[PDB]
């Protein structure tokens, strides 16, 4: 990803976009009951905590484009992945406006709380004013599609979330690149069935985990993985993607019956963005908030890993590459041991910056004991080994519970954390509940006890 140019929006015919400047994150009733070191991300260039230029920091993720065209290894990767996806008999017909808007089997309705993007955000028009969940009315949307068309600028907002102290000082805030509601709708109409097929088929065939339920999926993953696991982290994955990776994605789409609308991919690759009073053009880089971000990043990850394996290990048997991606996150395997360090080396030539799994300083062997996926470890249940626990460390949960974005959601927020935490065991879960109940807010919540969650879990399979 690389920014071609950036300049005042008015110079290119666009209005200034108002973006919040104050975090909605504030210390929760549990702020001093649990340990934590994260704080709300910087949202404005004048944040006191900043120790470097803000604008430069948030856009530094665009490290450039290392590759121009699709080489032979990538083409091979494309053929293998596409051939694999072919076995799913994915429905290639366009999805009707109604379902694209309000959902159908395998595709949730459009999120009504998130930005409607340009130009709606500039006309003070919300999604709630356009969509009718009980009516499933498409008239207003259709009228808007005809009026403002598609391929509209993506509206950039700084993401309001917790970040390490280092990332706050270095202005390393993440960005939300919201595609207009029109584009989102058009893309779900174009690829709606592809998305549904992926959501209904998490595993090693789609090579994707999007739409998965960790509580149930964790027990299925091992049986899908090979003998030897391998994994690694990406530094700024989305933004590092070069145009060639988007072209490779289109080839996959053409081969599986969607050649009909690969043009939509161009809109993602060569994209137009609005931020505050500036507009900028990016070549490469996956936009962070459009309908399909996760899925397309996952598909591209499948192409990347196959490519690096072909480039590094000629003769590799991709039919025995078993991987599951979720955007940039990935858990992979092969019958034979592979060197992630070598793969990482091959990765640089493709514009990818790969580092040791889970922030290790060195590339170590990945085992079922130390591997993580979506920040969750895998642990066989003590009583029924065949049931696998997705174990998210308490550290993350403690960090999260120390802040709130709305006192009215305290109950939901804390229940959510409980669904993640109990997997750490009864002793730990009870210590968590007790601390929660050491303050009034926590004592007034209705939280499930350990045995309740365990029973609920066994009854969910
Ligand atoms: Na882009």
How far apart, in whole angstroms, are the C-alpha atoms of residue 29 and residue 45?
Answer: 29
- Give me the residues near ligand 1 (ion), CB cutoff below 5 Å: 271, 282, 285
How far apart, in whole angstroms, are the C-alpha atoms of residue 354 and residue 298?
Answer: 16
Give the C-alpha distances (Å, rounded to integers) separating 442 from 1, 158, 231, 406, 453: 45, 31, 39, 15, 18
256 within 8 A of 82, measured Cβ to Cβ: yes
Q: Say which CATH number the domain at 438 has.
A: 1.20.960.20
Number of residues assigned to the chain: 461
Kindly give the distance from the C-alpha atom of residue 25 to the centroid of ligand 1, in angstroms, as a whole number.
Answer: 29
Kindly give the distance from the C-alpha atom of residue 250 to the centroid of ligand 1, in angstroms, as a whole number.
Answer: 14
CB atoms within 10 A of CB 348: 11
119 prior amide bond cis, ω within 30 = yes
In the chain, how many domains are there? 3
Kindly give the distance from the C-alpha atom of residue 439 to the centroid of ligand 1, in angstroms, as a whole number.
Answer: 47
Determine the 3-state secondary structure of 198 from DSSP: helix
256 is a domain residue: yes
Kindly give the distance from the C-alpha atom of residue 461 to the centroid of ligand 1, in angstroms, as a whole number.
Answer: 40
Kindly give the distance from the C-alpha atom of residue 270 to the centroid of ligand 1, in angstroms, as a whole number.
Answer: 5
Kindly give the distance from the C-alpha atom of residue 440 to the centroid of ligand 1, in angstroms, as a whole number.
Answer: 48
342, 316: one domain: yes
Which parts are annotated binding residues? 233, 328
CA atoms within 13 A on the CB side of 353: 13
- Element holding 27 (H helix, E strand): strand 26-27
Kindly give the distance from the C-alpha atom of residue 2 to the centroid of ligand 1, in angstroms, as a whole number.
Answer: 8
Kindly give the distance from the C-alpha atom of residue 454 to the centroid of ligand 1, in angstroms, as a whole number.
Answer: 44
The per-residue DSSP string of 279-324 comes to EEEEES---SBSTTHHHHHHHHHHHHHHHHHHHHSTT--GGG-EEE
CB atoms within 10 A of CB 268: 24
247, 237: one domain: no
Which parts are annotated binding residues for Mg(2+)? 233, 328
Q: Say which CATH number the domain at 230 has.
A: 3.30.70.270
96 is a domain residue: yes
> Which residue is listed with tokens 């665009």?
62
332, 387: one domain: no
115, 253: one domain: yes
CB atoms within 10 A of CB 100: 27
Solved with: X-ray
Kindly give the distance from the C-alpha atom of residue 4 to the centroid of ligand 1, in angstroms, as a whole number.
Answer: 11
What domain range is 92 assigned to? 1-13+70-202+243-284
Resolution limit in angstroms? 2.3
363 prior amide bond cis, ω within 30 = no
């Amino acid at each position: 990803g690389e920014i071609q140019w950036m300049r005042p929006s008015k110079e290119v015919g666009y209005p200034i976009i108002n973006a919040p400047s104050k975090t909605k994150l504030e210390p929760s009733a549990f702020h001093y009951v649990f340990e934590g070191v994260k704080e709300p991300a910087v949202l404005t260039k004048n944040d006191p905590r900043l120790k470097t230029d803000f604008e430069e920091a948030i856009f530094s993720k665009y490290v450039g484009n290392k590759i121009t065209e699709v080489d032979e290894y990538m083409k091979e990767a494309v053929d293998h992945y596409a051939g694999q996806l072919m076995s799913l008999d994915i429905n290639t017909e366009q999805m009707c406006l109604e379902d694209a808007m309000y959902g159908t089997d395998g595709l949730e309705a459009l999120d009504l709380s998130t930005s409607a993007g340009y130009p709606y955000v500039a006309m003070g028009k919300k999604k709630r004013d356009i969509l009718n969940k009980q009516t499933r009315d498409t008239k207003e949307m259709q009228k808007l599609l005809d009026t403002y068309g598609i391929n509209l600028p993506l509206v950039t907002y700084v993401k309001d979330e917790l970040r390490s102290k280092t990332k706050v000082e270095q202005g390393k805030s993440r960005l939300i690149e919201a595609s207009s509601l029109n584009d989102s709708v058009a893309m779900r109409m174009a690829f709606g069935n592809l998305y549904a097929a992926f959501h209904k088929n998490p595993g090693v065939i789609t090579g994707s985990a999007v739409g998965c339920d960790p509580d149930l999926f964790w027990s299925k993953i091992p049986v899908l993985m090979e003998e030897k696991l391998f994994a690694f982290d990406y530094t700024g994955y989305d933004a590092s993607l070069s145009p060639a990776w988007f072209e490779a994605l289109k080839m996959v789409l053409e081969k599986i019956g969607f050649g009909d609308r690969v043009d939509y991919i161009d809109y993602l690759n060569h994209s137009h963005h609005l931020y505050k009073n500036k507009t900028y053009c990016v070549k490469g880089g996956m936009p962070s908030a459009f309908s399909g971000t996760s899925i397309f990043n996952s598909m591209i990850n499948n192409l990347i890993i196959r490519t690096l394996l072909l480039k590094t290990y000629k003769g590799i048997d991709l039919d025995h590459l078993k991987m599951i991606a979720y955007g940039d996150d990935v858990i992979a395997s092969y019958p034979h041991e592979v060197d992630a360090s070598l793969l990482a080396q091959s990765g640089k030539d493709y514009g990818l910056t790969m580092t040791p799994a889970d922030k290790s300083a060195t590339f170590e062997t990945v085992t079922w004991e130390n591997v993580t996926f979506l920040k969750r470890f895998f642990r066989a249940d003590e009583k029924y080994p065949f049931l696998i626990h997705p174990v998210m460390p308490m550290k993350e949960i403690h960090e999260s519970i120390r802040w709130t974005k709305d006192p009215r959601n305290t109950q939901d927020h804390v229940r959510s954390l409980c669904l993640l935490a109990w997997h750490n065991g009864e002793e730990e879960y009870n210590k968590f509940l007790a601390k929660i109940r050491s303050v009034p807010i926590g004592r007034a919540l209705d939280l499930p006890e350990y045995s309740t969650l365990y029973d609920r879990w066994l009854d969910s399979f």
